Design a protein around this ligand. Structure first.
Ligand SMILES: CC(C)(C)[C@@H]1NC(=O)O[C@@H]2CCC[C@H]2OC/C=C/C(F)(F)c2nc3ccccc3nc2O[C@@H]2C[C@@H](C(=O)N[C@]3(C(=O)NS(=O)(=O)C4(C)CC4)C[C@H]3C(F)F)N(C2)C1=O
Ligand SMILES: [Zn+2]
Length: 192
């Protein structure tokens, strides 16, 4: 089937919030068709398949997300579904051309180690960067609270995107660190 945009998160300005755009029935129908009547607004899109829900982040004109969520599927669009311009299983990364209305986030270059994840519910979860692709949670939290936020943005204090949430370091139901796809990896991405 198709990946469907069932919601959005606008990060510019005040404390962000999530905005639902479709329901169960409409998302199933639109994953069957591939025709998305709704307009695209925001920098972070809530994405769903017939079975899974996750996030995508708009950077450099492209909606990026995780392969373990979208696989090789297409993204519903105005007229027809959009084909993936980027696919990399090793990086767990996939990318579709950003349609009209999708606002891109600017890459981070400040070197700030004080990052935060924006979840699918628009919660802010801070973490201290300790490597190229890892950041330690300031407080451990149950893994279930992070589920469904893969593909969401890992942000710097300035509002620029340092990375894309990919996986969690967890033990016995409790997450201690986030692992993400560095933003520098999305610019050096081969338009297949
Ligand atoms: C134990 C754990 C937390 C479940 C697991 N940790 C884990 O593997 O830790 C190791 C050690 C340190 C980093 C990581 O190195 C391995 C990298 C794995 C990977 F991620 F690159 C990945 N490449 C794939 C490529 C092709 C096909 C399948 C793939 N499957 C993968 O990983 C899988 C998926 C990923 C996941 O659940 N991501 C999140 C999420 O919310 N998803 S989701 O939206 O609900 C949903 C399932 C709908 C899409 C953000 C974390 C949230 F839950 F916090 N996983 C397992 C984990 O995070
Ligand atoms: Zn920055």
């Amino acid at each position: 089937g198709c990946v469907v945009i069932v919601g959005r998160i606008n990060l510019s300005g005040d404390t962000a919030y999530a905005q639902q755009t479709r329901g169960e029935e409409g998302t199933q129908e639109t994953s069957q068709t591939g025709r998305d009547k709704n307009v695209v607004t925001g920098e972070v899109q809530v994405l769903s398949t017939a079975t899974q829900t996750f996030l995508g982040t708009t950077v450099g004109g492209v909606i990026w997300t995780v392969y373990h969520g979208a696989g090789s599927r297409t993204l519903a669009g105005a007229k027809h579904p959009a084909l993936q311009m980027y696919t990399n299983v090793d990086q767990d990364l996939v990318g579709w051309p950003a349609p009209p209305g999708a606002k891109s986030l600017e890459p981070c270059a400040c070197g700030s180690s004080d990052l935060y994840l924006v979840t699918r519910d628009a919660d802010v979860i801070p973490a201290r960067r300790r490597g190229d692709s890892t950041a330690s949670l300031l407080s451990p939290r149950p893994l279930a609270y992070l589920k469904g936020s893969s593909g969401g943005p890992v942000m710097c204090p300035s509002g620029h995107v340092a990375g894309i949430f990919r996986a969690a370091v967890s033990t016995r139901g409790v997450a201690k660190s986030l692992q993400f796809i560095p933003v520098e990896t999305l610019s050096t991405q081969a338009r297949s």
